[PDB]
């Protein structure tokens, strides 16, 4: 049977009709998993919280409990997870607090390793790979494609650019750029994920765009202010270049340099 | 019922009224539960030890573990903990060595956050925060207030002064004076925790006397025995101070500059 | 000795002797040898071999495949020999095809909680690793080294014998045999005298690694010049050409 008769599901679960969820593993209240997803054993699964299908849930897992943030004070805040994701071994992912938007978002085809952490009302977009023991500390938003390598940590309301890449044990206190490296604590940029851009087939012209870009924002000497105005022309011709610009834009505790 | 038949309670164990212990939970020999504190499932007790009440323990910790770091255990050694403590998932809390204390200390209100690590013979005191991650490792001494942000990692014997705070990543391997802020990997003395002290209430003028407290032992060249004569005055009208003063006092392996 | 609350696969060998926890998985191919102690909530996964008077501590994870993309499903290993000591909550993932197939650990080592070995790994002997230590993975560690505190080593390292990090170390390139390393990136400092006195090395030995030490870091020579100027005190000293050879065996370059 799909189910293991020494898993515990709470009644009000909400299950696809193939699901599979190994023994001793705790599905809560108003906990709803899609089709195709499969739970492992030991793993604990806490509500509000929506899971989407063809994920992967690993054991030692806690998946939907609430922040230990002391602003939080019981109130029902949820978490949305989509589809394809694996979850690895010892992850943890809490649920939003009601400060922000009461809610923790995963996207779809994202890979966490083993004793990430992600914190209460992040959101994670799709494609993103976060190494073991990554931790992000709540707030944080992590765009597509962005990869973070093993023990990166990243600080409360810290944003996380597309395609971009963290070294391993960065710790991350100022925003990360669209496209751009960075490495070591304090983390410091080290110039564009081009490997990864590459890899997924940008295009020549965008690749040179962007490594134009780069310099505009971190070695002629201009404020973000003056950089986002130089960077206005090259944002109108490229999509990639303007991910770039709106990622500066939109940074509440600057950008790493 | 509150003790949950999946769990397993060993003879010896001695719970009070309204313990919770949740499934799959292993409470040793040897282990006291006080009153109203909740065990979550998955969680490993071992003993002797003694929890206080109105705790709450998050599954997959391990708390009461012998070290690793003697290939020999001693017994008996101990683990206390106090009241109205919350210790999250995965922590890992080891008892004492016979060698040294012979018991590892903590004391009420603290919040141990994911994953955090508390290492042979350490003594916590009360409303301390160790954020996830956070890894004392032997000895350690953590003073009233505290906070310590993730991953922090404090190395053996040092003591963490009363309100101060470290950022995350940093690695502690000299003691932290009260109210200081450190960083870094080495960690490195910043500034003061002038927030702490404002959320504690402190007047205007004792936070004044804790600024220049502050320059008296970092930024005017003076030796620790000098800068100590320098701070008796201000130590005297200030309890504030004093417990500057004080940290600084009882630091003999040197302080974090 | 085998709680009647674990789950053991009928393909699963254990022998003789062996005790498993209550709400552990022992899975399909798993062998396990005598005298091993499976805690409680421990995961096995196989193919995997597990050899004698080893214990391993609740929430491990050992012999699942790496999430890494490059591992397709492949039939890969993990053999791990006799009197080790896994704590909570350690990670060991077995091989890829792209390597050797094989993750593999020997005797007497510590892998302390939370530690994670990586993918096609090579533990020797008699190593300590501390909390949360991460083995990113082909990283191979050799006899009594000593890797402190949350310590992360980058794909294809190689940690030297006797060599010793300091917490929070983060290696990125190959740690020569008794080299003590520090920060983030990992630095070379000086060299493990203690784990050379533990060894019982005589005084002389000691002498001529200090004096080797300097000769690769501390009088301006290249690697080659440095390889050169060892060969007499390695031909003179086993103790010297086990540090010669972890130089010279670095393709990548030394920590600095």
């Not at 009000?12 to 193939?18: E, N, T």
């Not at 309301?157 to 960075?182: E, L, Q």
């Not at 490594?211 to 986002?228: F, N």
Request: with cysteine; net charge negative; charged share 20%.
């Amino acid at each position: 049977s799909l189910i293991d008769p020494r898993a515990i599901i709470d009644p009000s679960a909400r299950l696809a009709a193939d699901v599979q969820v190994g023994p001793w593993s705790i599905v809560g209240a108003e906990v709803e998993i899609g089709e195709g997803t499969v739970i492992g054993p030991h793993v604990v699964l806490k509500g509000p919280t929506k899971i989407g299908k063809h994920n992967r849930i690993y054991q030692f897992s806690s998946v939907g409990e609430d922040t230990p943030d002391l602003k939080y004070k019981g109130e029902p805040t949820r978490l949305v997870i989509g589809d394809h994701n694996v979850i690895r071994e010892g992850v943890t992912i809490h649920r939003g607090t009601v400060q922000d938007r009461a809610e923790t978002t995963i996207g779809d085809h994202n890979l966490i390793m083993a004793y990430a952490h992600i914190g209460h009302d992040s959101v994670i977009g799709n494609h993103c790979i976060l190494v073991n023991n990554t931790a992000l500390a709540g707030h944080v938003h992590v765009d597509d494609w962005a990869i973070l390598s093993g023990y990166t940590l990243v600080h409360q309301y810290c944003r996380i650019g597309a395609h971009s890449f963290s070294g391993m044990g960065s710790a991350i206190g100022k925003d990360v750029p669209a496209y751009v490296t960075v490495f070591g604590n304090p983390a410091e940029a080290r110039s564009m994920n081009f490997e990864g851009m590459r890899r997924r087939g940008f295009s020549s012209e965008a690749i040179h765009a962007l490594r134009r870009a780069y310099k505009v924002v971190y070695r002629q000497g201009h404020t973000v202010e003056e950089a986002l105005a130089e960077l206005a022309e090259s944002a109108a011709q490229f999509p990639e270049v303007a991910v770039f610009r709106d990622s500066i834009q939109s940074a509440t505790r600057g950008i790493t340099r």
